[PDB]
Ligand binder design. Sequence first.
Ligand SMILES: Nc1ncnc2c1ncn2[C@@H]1O[C@H](COP(=O)(O)OP(=O)(O)OP(=O)(O)O)[C@@H](O)[C@H]1O
Ligand SMILES: Nc1ncnc2c1ncn2[C@@H]1O[C@H](COP(=O)(O)OP(=O)(O)OP(=O)(O)O)[C@@H](O)[C@H]1O
Ligand SMILES: Nc1nc2c(ncn2[C@@H]2O[C@H](COP(=O)(O)OP(=O)(O)O)[C@@H](O)[C@H]2O)c(=O)[nH]1
Ligand SMILES: Nc1nc2c(ncn2[C@@H]2O[C@H](COP(=O)(O)OP(=O)(O)O)[C@@H](O)[C@H]2O)c(=O)[nH]1
Lengths: 447, 449, 100
Amino acid sequence: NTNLRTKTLRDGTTAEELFSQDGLSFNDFIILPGFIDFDSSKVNVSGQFTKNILLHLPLVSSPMDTVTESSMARAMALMGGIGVIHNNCTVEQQARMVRSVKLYRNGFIMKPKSVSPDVPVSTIRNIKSEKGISGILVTEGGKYDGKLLGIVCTKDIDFVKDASAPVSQYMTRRENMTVERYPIKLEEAMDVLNRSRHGYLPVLNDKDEVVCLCSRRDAVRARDYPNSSLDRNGHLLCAAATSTREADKGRVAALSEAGIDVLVLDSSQGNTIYQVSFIRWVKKTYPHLEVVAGNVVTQDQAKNLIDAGADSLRIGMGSVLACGRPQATAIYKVARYAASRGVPCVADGGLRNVGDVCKALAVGANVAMLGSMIAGTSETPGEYFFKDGMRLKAVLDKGSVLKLLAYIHKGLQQSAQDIGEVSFDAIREKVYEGQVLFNRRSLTAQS
Amino acid sequence: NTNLRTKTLRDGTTAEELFSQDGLSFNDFIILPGFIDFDSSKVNVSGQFTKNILLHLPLVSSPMDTVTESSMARAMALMGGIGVIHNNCTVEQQARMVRSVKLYRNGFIMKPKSVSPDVPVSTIRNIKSEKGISGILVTEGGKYDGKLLGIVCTKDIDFVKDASAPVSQYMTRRENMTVERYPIKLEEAMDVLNRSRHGYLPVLNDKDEVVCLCSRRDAVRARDYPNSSLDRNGHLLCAAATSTREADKGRVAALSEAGIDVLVLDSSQGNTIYQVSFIRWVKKTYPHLEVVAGNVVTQDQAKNLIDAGADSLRIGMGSVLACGRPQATAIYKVARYAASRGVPCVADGGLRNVGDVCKALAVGANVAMLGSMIAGTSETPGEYFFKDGMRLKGYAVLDKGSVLKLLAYIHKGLQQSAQDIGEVSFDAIREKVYEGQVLFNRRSLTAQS
Amino acid sequence: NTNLRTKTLRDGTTAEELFSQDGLSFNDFIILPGFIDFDSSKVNVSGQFTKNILLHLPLVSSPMDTVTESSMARAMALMGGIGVIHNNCTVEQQARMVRS
Ligand SMILES: Nc1ncnc2c1ncn2[C@@H]1O[C@H](COP(=O)(O)OP(=O)(O)OP(=O)(O)O)[C@@H](O)[C@H]1O
Ligand SMILES: Nc1ncnc2c1ncn2[C@@H]1O[C@H](COP(=O)(O)OP(=O)(O)OP(=O)(O)O)[C@@H](O)[C@H]1O
Ligand SMILES: Nc1nc2c(ncn2[C@@H]2O[C@H](COP(=O)(O)OP(=O)(O)O)[C@@H](O)[C@H]2O)c(=O)[nH]1
Ligand SMILES: Nc1nc2c(ncn2[C@@H]2O[C@H](COP(=O)(O)OP(=O)(O)O)[C@@H](O)[C@H]2O)c(=O)[nH]1
């Protein structure tokens, strides 16, 4: 239906004209509708977080100590986005959070949590309550590669009152265990696990030592979250923030060991000599890492940071107070310039509802960073408390971040539908082409 | 430490003097502190819901269609309180909600949900998704008492791609199942279940027909909720509301069949001839049922409804109609009169924070009814939605999260208040209030800032 | 680092264009960021109060009778600025404040 979808009258204003005068926020303009011949279910909202990482869900959790720790990053990656673990912590704590995110979901679990036979049941209960993993292997000397002696699961210890008893008293013992022998393809191993009606399947060598471990929970997670952002080994994608000082070099190394796939530079004004040097050093020393430089708001800053070797750009400054730029103009300008050079952009700031996120993605941003919009969800750091009959964490309880991410997803889909394009890549292309049009709204026209 | 706890100077105002003038609400007065020689954890907040039903947690969910359905009543019963299933529904819907509450927790599971071998996996998934029960028995002709053929659990069908496949293809077959033979004591059966590391244990006769079923989930529910309000058969307590018209008689019967333990009469002004007749008829026809009459706010009304045979009274009227009464005065007066006659009372209305609940319990109410305070928790009826960057509930209110966390918060608050007052139980607080050893101070309008 | 500091794309609006239309207050505009290769400690904020007087601190206390007398002028001069003693007084009082 290209004859019906193609605008020839072009009654409206193109992005280039809209952003050619004064700096705009998202309320200053609206997107005009197009032609619909599809359901909102079929809309692809995906966007590039970096040159090589495509997110099924163009949403990134902001690296604030009040928003993104291991739990938030896990939720984001599971729903098809990603989270940036904040850097307001020691290097070891940040690496531990990254490791939690990366080893939450696996195919073969290579370093399965293991204990020695004399460990008390209390310790396994602590592991399950704190780290949330069951099917703890009991091996010679507790080494994750030692001889397999048994396994401890939920129903093996849920009835015992003496929490100091050794696991050897209640574990399922090796002689009675369904196991597999190295080597084995993940497909066959997991189908065997399914047929076995058990929750775990260790994989051992010829010496009965633990090679790895398969978990039914990973299969069920794959079934319940088919769009999770994953690496090539089946782990959830994870990003981590860092400043560009010389000390932070150490930090970077640690994160690289923990397995981050994206490094995000933390700066209000990223067009500095220190950030340029840092990006060069990161791309040289850890080529496998992708770097999101920023923050920037003008095309000059973007030119410098892209020349340095940035894989993506963080847009935002102001969304004492004498330096910055209205956020919608910043996004349009920087994202257009960066796209001309093949670099996607992240919108960071002033994104307070679904209409704003949609506008920010339409005017050039590939993905959007969420801070306030997801603050107070169950997955954020912090403790809940009651006050005035409201439950707060301060901000009000917004429940699960997963339900909110699904809400934002449906909102973006319906908006793209009304605009008349079945994907946001198409929306951005047609915006640059002048086939998706806008209207600036007078101040009165805003209600 | 009776020398230190016993007030002889008695610097303060007794409840009788406090409520002797104009009608008061809860902000008009404060409770004076006493003597502390115990930690707040050791405080017993329990109160009588009726002549025969004691609640470890003196909280009742209000029978409003926006507050109490099966899920809320279950949560309340589990935390040591109770819920009243609302009556803004058909008799069949109310009985179904009551059944949901009553059969959630069991010892021996009677009439275990079972299916025939040709049933598709889709049906088992539907059972798990709607009603929330696993371990479906597969029997001769699907009869809950037929010959046992197998069992279908979570891990038996979580991997299957053809939801139309028969359960017999993936069920665990009877020859491989750990089972027990009638008769068996629940204690031995549950220890067997524990040792077996399985989730379910059927109990069969000599013909391999299903007699009953034990669920490990019940053991874990008992472990995680040790204070659950239970009847004598191990089921959660459940209450249900009804009006006092002639038609509602039918309703009562149905609810009685569903297994309610308390009937609650719904009326803004319960001192009527219709309610008196209804209470007489209920106590006559269903002696096993306990009735909470109301609503009332004066000792006249309380006399009539207790003479009718009420086992408890709901206090509250007004918390444009010109008739009602300030809630704290109403509670004190009616609860004092009813206690003189051996009947506990429920405070219903104007309860908006924990201090008000503590005050209402101290001045005579045995338990407190919560409506607004718990509306918008996850367990209430209604659908969640996002609006203006806020999570709300609709058929609007703000999301308060889990009602369980809220109930625990109220529990800790009541305990700390009782500690500051200097008594280790709320029965003690009520007794000492009537005795003049727990004292109050009326607050001037200025003193409330 | 002149290659990195020098704007060639010039994505933004020059002062001449900004002030070419209607009269603006300070909230009507914002300054765009540039390139950083130094610490804020090294920034020179000095400005000429007059053709021959350079102030290390480009701040002047207003000559209002509620703001600037001898003490304020002293504080300003000491911190690198200057103060203007108000003229809502006799000549002798103003001269005495100046002398102080
Ligand atoms: N490979 C195995 N061989 C034999 N028995 C096993 C094996 N793995 C687990 N078990 C036993 O079966 C039961 C495991 O159930 P499961 O793995 O589903 O527990 P979980 O992962 O902790 O979560 P949940 O049981 O609540 O679904 C336990 O009794 C355990 O001892
Ligand atoms: N009495 C029994 N005898 C033999 N097998 C049983 C018995 N009860 C349950 N099973 C089987 O145990 C295996 C694992 O149980 P499954 O995890 O699927 O459900 P569950 O025991 O209720 O625990 P959960 O649903 O939390 O995982 C299933 O194949 C189930 O059919
Ligand atoms: N037994 C078991 N181990 C898991 C599972 N999932 C992940 N693991 C592993 O458990 C380990 C937990 O981290 P660990 O190094 O033991 O603790 P830390 O030193 O405090 O970080 C990780 O190495 C994970 O790979 C599971 O489902 N079962
Ligand atoms: N298989 C199984 N049945 C249960 C369990 N818990 C309760 N039940 C029984 O399952 C039945 C629920 O289905 P049912 O009431 O017969 O259907 P309804 O008439 O439409 O409400 C009840 O008889 C419960 O007693 C459980 O854990 N497993």
